[PDB]
């Protein structure tokens, strides 16, 4: 294909806007180590007796590419052009390349590393097109490409969980599956070789890049009464009374449509002002949980809900938020306060979704009679009922693009709770390993497992080219709308740029919902 | 197009039944005033501090046509032919005309009005085809065409609500949208000119014009046992016992299908007999409510439920009913009793839907053991679960035809709670205004807003032509069925006709569900 | 394209003279380090509180090529053929190549550097054709190619200034723009690869390579009187008197044309003889300045003016000169005297431009009457008035070729003050970087920014080929003209050649204006 002295690819980063489509291209330099030192390891939770944290699986010698966050594909300026001018976006097609491969050997002598080119060494690359391997993308995990184009990123090690059991610690059972990645055809690359593949997204709904400019309970003409007559009260004579729904009677009016279903969330005050928190409680005791088998885990974030009520504006739904550290590299060994963490604000869905820590509503709790007074209480948690409408969670420049829909007999509204595009056929996983280069063999043959290798690592460039379909904003609104703008003011470095020491700084989460549209 | 002395259209009222389709045509005389005196007004709830009743929006100089009730398009006799002979109906296409336009000027001198033709004055008409304006149809509000063909109807004024906030009264915010209707292309009509447009409905499910002749729990052959063995009890020895489901064991039988999901409603006795009401309580305190943002409002009517259990036949689900005044013009300033109000009766859905004030069922509340006895309670409110089946609300001659489905990421069974056809693309709103005719200008130019106008109003005729698709009744039932008939007996005027003073009288609600069909 | 063992280009240095065009070709060896160690740095003036020196911007990992001085493209002998034989020159087209690329790695062990070829490493090259990056060429800054063909030149690091504000030091604001150069498509080159592009200059005026042989006030025939009669005086009787402009009356004659507009400059005596200087004053206090925002800066050099009056021949306009060190590498840490600095002499423009420290002329300062005597003073600074004509600044073998015209709504005579060709579309900037080669990655994946790299640098050859359009000298002058010649006499090394230690010596500035032409 190509020799030692020719480049096998070129650098491509741009965004192209044509018609109803935008094409993003981005190139990175990647680094791949040799993981596990060329073996598979059965990994578990060990002696841990807590069923909730138990797991069983395998770490592999293979690495992988994760481009599943938007800021991989969009500059902040391009994200601005997207969210200010368009009502919708969905992924269409994908092209991925690996080129300019460099395999290197590391030799240590007397605490002295020397790095040299190994020109005859290979890397192996394959994509899993039929989704025959455990799919670890779409879990919102690190190891994604860094947003900034000149940043290098080490490829994460591939591993997976498989079925486990609880007896005196995690154990594999008969349903536990092992996957050898060397049991798949992969092409081998020396420095001259390159790799590419293409992918087409299935048809999915456009993400809704707008906020509603109307509330689900305001849909009627304010100037006219309804012709409906609703039950009002029972008179002292015990006879039922009916009241006409009249203009301004909004509490009593009959409606065709209901807010979407929700869990109840606990409210926390994350910002200055408003109703203050109770002290010394953790979400693990008091939060929403999911029972699965013998295990519990916190239900986070669940379907999206409105973030706050006005006047309570500093409060958050505890578990309904996506937190992201302002410093991507901040260590998770210690907790952080609100000042260190970017938290998503879902207020755009307030017209249809209801606020997280508000109950869905009230429910009648009894059947009344002459001697039984009517009673009612809160409806905290409610499933789907005919007439409900809701918005999905917003997508963020720093958030995940897609998630793989689990393969199941049934689903309800398969929109991922973390946000993004639910896909029956997500983009295939791209696996990469350094081909093992054995060390010096013994002169006299011995029967043993081969543990001796030359230390290798590889580096190169990768281009990701995505095509995005757009819905144009079409609106007769007379007055100006809300736009995302730079209101950062005076700074010691440019926002969404490198700082003095070269660290890339994105301290603000950016959603898509700025333009408005009627219900 | 046409002069002063030629009619621009003819009167058309008929119903045509051909094959699987019925075509309704109806003509009315309309009256349009000049609303707001040619200005837009920002309208709010004012100083009201109650968040529940707050709103913000605009009243417009424009009027509009609302034909969204069935009795606009169907005579009572045609409605009878529909409901006795057919299993289903859905709208197909729509044609609307405005013609024979007459613009008139009103001059008042010394408390004396004179009305004269203004031959050079215009009206403006446009339809909003792309649904770019706030859609106020489908809220079951007055200003619809009157059922009776020779009744004149004044066109209602168009207004809308837009996003508001709660601080010290209702306020507009940055998401609040203003819409100038003069920012749309509209054709202008003098007395010779006419207007028309056509519309096609999207494919929607046929309304179910039948009642089920079977109950969801009776579906099996009564002559045969099941081969299923269900858990029955635990013996005094603590061992589980299994009982065979045998013919007649209907309470214990395994089934494939579940009744539809429901809210629990409070029961009220609206008629003579049965269990009497508790005294002096109102639905606002005790009823089902919806939390939306910081607001509450009564959940009415919600998905349809069965109206009563037999022997309780006089009771109603409080909030699950559509009330309609027997006198359409009865003032809403005072409450009414059952004798003044027509209330819908949903008993046809009793086979699948369950009764409004009955809980869905019972639920086990605990995990038993040797020292823990099993407990259970009522399941009042339940969302959708696999295996549920239900009926939608019935449509009525006096009820709404369609509702606009809110534009949202997700929906569950988008059938409108008030009944009718949920539409992603409903029929477009038809807006009409009297073109402002300015009064005498000042001889010397002055810089000021122009407030001086000649008083105008317009009148004309409008034809609505709808095409309806039908499903023919196909049944092997041997015995006669239920039919809608005239059983009114002796009256001082014909029912569904004018009375002595010319008022049109429809005192009986008429559903579609008479014919029966098996589950 | 090419392997390890083949050259990807050849050495080209020549000048071709054909017809009205000259083609210059020149080749250099370049060296590129890795700047900033593969990061962008936000750079400011720091804690400096002086608004005049404040700045904000970015240094980039990229380098660039600057060939924007004439002695890059012309040997002294070719410059001689140009200026002695031609009246005009302008750039036409440009071709640039990068070839014979060598990427090398530096390894330090125990204070011992070893340099080795890295055969699989790349460089990245792109040109900014649409001028989408801050354009730093045309500011007369170092980092240009050295004149002498066998000299190697390190490529300068690319950086730029962006909008800043003054508050407690320089700050970035919302108008400050960051530019990632990796957000541009660039081709990647191994040792076999090469690069080229072509460019066409827009039509610009020929530089005027001649001096005028007439003065703007001598244009008339000396043998004939004018027929004009000019106001002369007012007699003791108060009546106005008119005097005929007669041959020899040059001070009183009417003329069609005016000298060009000018700032007033301060005169300094830079050479022996003439009127001596005042002592102990600096130009920062006493010089011409420009107010821009809250900042001041010295107005240098401004539009060109004549350098001196005869008899004052040792004086200079203080700020109107281009100084260039006779030693290009003399450090700027200390001031230099005239003997160390080559200073341009603009005397060729004396016919039309007026001398820098002379005022433009005299102006009447009052409106006289019987009791008010006429007064007048100096006109120091004057803008453009109808009838003015002027010459631009001369171009020098050691001076800049072009400058980018700022993109603005309006311009007056967009000829650069430093001299050369003002261009709306200047030659594109050529950016080059060493592709980062990552070092050994950690075996166990960690989430951190990648700071580990192998030290790289690159070298190669670059050819610049420019096409120049010429205007031929056409003159009927009988007597010989002024020519540029070698009058250096006896030297220890050849002038415009290397010295004993190999340093290239050009101690004399050479303008283009030798041939003469009438006004």
Numbering used by the authors:
A (entry chain I), B (entry chain A), C (entry chain J): 214 to 732
Could you share sentences copied from the article?
Goose parvovirus (GPV) is a member of Parvoviridae, a family of non-enveloped single-stranded DNA (ssDNA) viruses with T = 1 icosahedral capsids. Adeno-associated viruses (AAVs) are also in this genus, which are widely used as vectors for gene therapy applications. It is noteworthy to mention that few dependoparvoviruses, such as GPV and Muscovy duck parvovirus (MDPV), are pathogenic and do not require coinfection with a helper virus to replicate in host cells. On the other hand, the “right” ORF expresses the three capsid viral proteins (VPs), VP1 (81 kDa), VP2 (65 kDa), and VP3 (60 kDa), that assemble the icosahedral capsid, with VP3 being the major capsid protein. Goose parvovirus (GPV) is an etiological agent of Derzsy’s disease, afflicting geese and Muscovy ducks worldwide.
The Bac-to-Bac® baculovirus expression system was used to produce VLPs of GPV comprised of VP3 exclusively. From these micrographs, capsid images were used to reconstruct a 3D GPV capsid structure with a final resolution of 2.43 Å. The GPV capsid structure shows surface morphologies generally conserved among parvoviruses, including five-fold channels, three-fold protrusions, two-fold depressions, and two/three-fold walls. The beginning of structural ordering at the N-terminus was observed at alanine 214, which is similar to most AAV VP structures determined to date. Following alanine 214, the VP3 amino acid side chain densities were well ordered to leucine 732 at the C-terminus. The overall GPV VP structure conserves the core β-strand A, the eight-stranded anti-parallel β-barrel (βB-βI), and the α-helix A, as well as the general positioning of the surface loops. Significant differences were observed in several variable regions, including VR-III, VR-IV, VR-V, and VR-VII. GPV has the largest VR-III loop, which is a result of AAV5, AAV2, and QAAV possessing one, two, or three amino acid deletions in the corresponding region, respectively. In short, GPV may not interact with SIA nor HSPG for transduction initiation, and it is unlikely that the GPV capsid binds to AAVR. Monomer alignments of GPV, QAAV, AAV2, and AAV5 show that the DE and HI loops (which form the five-fold region) of GPV have very similar conformations, which explains its mAb 2–7 recognition.
